[PDB]
Amino acid sequence: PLESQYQVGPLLGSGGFGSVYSGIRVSDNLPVAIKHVEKDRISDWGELPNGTRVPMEVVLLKKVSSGFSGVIRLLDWFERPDSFVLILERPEPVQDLFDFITERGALQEELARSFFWQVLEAVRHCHNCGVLHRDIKDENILIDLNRGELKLIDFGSGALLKDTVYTDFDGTRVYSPPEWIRYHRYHGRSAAVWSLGILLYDMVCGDIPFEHDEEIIRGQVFFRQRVSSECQHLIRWCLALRPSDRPTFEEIQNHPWMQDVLLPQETAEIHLH
Ligand SMILES: N[C@H]1CCCN(c2cncc(-c3[nH]nc4ccc(-c5c(F)cccc5F)cc34)n2)C1
């Protein structure tokens, strides 16, 4: 059962994603997150190998939860009469990248370089497992403050990775590529790289670059903060209006601005602790 397995604490959040409660596995005080969601509010269904009709979020999660990674992992789940309850990891102390930036203002480039890299590595992981997150942002990235490690969260907008076109999008708008805005059509990888450019700008500037459809499609990036020239270049390269002019993951990771990254543990010693 559940309540017998987990001792539910206070509500951590609630929204489209449902309601998230702080919790702890009784077996070993492991800190966990307990996410509840009503079936009636589930749009994207799918099924496990054994063919169980579960939320696509569960399918994906299970696919990226094997072994170590920068993705909060799904420990266990439960089906209820009118809802699904997922048991997910819970760093402690932890803080999402949104509040972190909101608190600290634009980040130092060395810190951003560390964070972004970890992000990239986690997205390459997801794609290896054939999963497309579809909603990468500072709100869906948690920071394990004592480790300096970032974890991806919220796969309820995700999709199985595919080489053909996507015509559905239910992720964050201002983070949506121009090709979706204009044509309602996009491809996995390249649309991902567009959101990774929004994120990078977001870190180094403290706020996303575009706000209106007009801005997203014009593709003009103005820097509100003092950013290195190498960094503005990588950012403008990810925000290339034409999907095929955007860099590949390997290209992003091989960008000058991305050399000499600090490992997590030092990132924490230097910028968090
Ligand atoms: N739109 C996003 C924004 C954040 C909440 N959302 C989701 C969606 N799917 C999984 C998890 C989630 N899985 N494990 C967790 C441990 C802590 C906290 C956590 C936290 F550290 C700080 C504030 C709020 C929190 F919810 C969340 C966790 N969270 C929706």
Chain breaks in the chain (C to N over 2.5 A) after: none
**CA dihedral sign, ordered 44, 46, 3, 34:** negative
Burial of 192 (0-12, 13-18, 19+ CB in 10 A): buried
162: its two tokens: 């595919």
Q: Which tokens belong to 44? A: 């994207």
What does the buried/exposed string (b/e) look like for 13-49 if buried means 16 or more CB atoms within 10 Å of the residue's CB? Answer: eeeebbbbbbbbbeeeeeebbbbbbeeeebeeebeee
CB 154 within 8 A of CB 37: no
Q: Is the CB of 267 inside a 6 Å radius of any atom of ligand 1? A: no
Alpha-carbon distance 11 to 20, whole Å?
A: 6
Annotation marks residue 163 as catalytic: no
The full DSSP string for 197-258 is: HHHHHHHHHSS-S--SHHHHHHT----SS---HHHHHHHHHHT-SSGGGSPPHHHHHTSGGG
Q: What residue has token string 């649309």?
A: 191
Q: Residue written as tokens 């209006």?
A: 241
Domain ranges of the chain: 1-92, 93-273
Ligand 1 pocket: which of 8, 154, 155, 157 to mutate (most atoms <8 Å of CB)? 154
Q: 64, 205, 198, 72: which is closest to 147 by C-alpha?
A: 72
CATH for the stretch 93-273: 1.10.510.10
DSSP symbol at 52: -
Q: Using an 8 Å Cβ cutoff, are 65 and 160 in contact?
A: no
Out of 135, 138, 144, 154, the active site residue is 135
Among protein residues, the one with the nearest Cα to ligand 1's atom 19 is 12
Task: Give me 13's structure tokens.
Answer: 């959040």
Contact between 106 and 205 under an 8 Å Cβ cutoff? The reply is yes
List of residues 6+ apart from 32 with CB closer than 8 A: 6, 23, 24, 25, 75, 87, 88, 89, 90
Please state whether the peptide bond connecting residue 178 to the residue before it is cis, i.e. omega within 30 degrees of 0.
no
How far is it, in rounded angstroms, from Cα 25 to Cα 45?
27
List Cα–Cα distances, 121 to 8, 126, 150, 221, 231, in angstroms: 32, 9, 10, 25, 18
Atom of ligand 1 lying closest to residue 32 CA: 16
- Bridge partners of 96? 142
CA–CA gap between residue 38 and residue 82 (Å, rounded) = 6
Q: What is the dihedral of CA 53, 59, 61, 65, to 10 degrees?
A: 110
Experimental method: X-ray
Given resolution (angstroms): 3.0
**DSSP per position, 104-126:** H-S--HHHHHHHHHHHHHHHHHH
In CATH, the number for domain 1-92 is 3.30.200.20
Amino acid at 146: N
Give the DSSP H or E segment for 190: helix 188-205
Distance CA 120, CA 71 (A): 11
- Give the CA distances from residue 220 to residues 178, 249, 251, 265, in Å, rounded to whole numbers and listed in that order: 12, 22, 22, 36
CB atoms inside a 10 Å sphere around CB 229? 7
| Phi then psi dihedrals of residue 56, to 5 deg | -60, -35
The number of helix segments (H) and strand segments (E) in the chain equals 9, 12
Query: Pocket of ligand 1, candidates 14, 61, 153: which has the most ligand atoms within 8 Å of its Cβ, to mutate?
Result: 153
Q: Is 67 annotated as a binding residue?
A: no
Q: Which amino acid is at 259?
A: Q
Cα-to-chain-centroid distance, residue 146 = 20
Q: Which two tokens stand for residue 1?
A: 């059962």
Please work out whether the CB of residue 153 comes within 6 Å of at least one atom of ligand 1: yes
Alpha-carbon gap, residue 36 to 20, rounded angstroms: 6
Angle among Cα 44, 47, 49 to the nearest 5 degrees reads: 155
| The two structure tokens encoding residue 250 | 């390997």
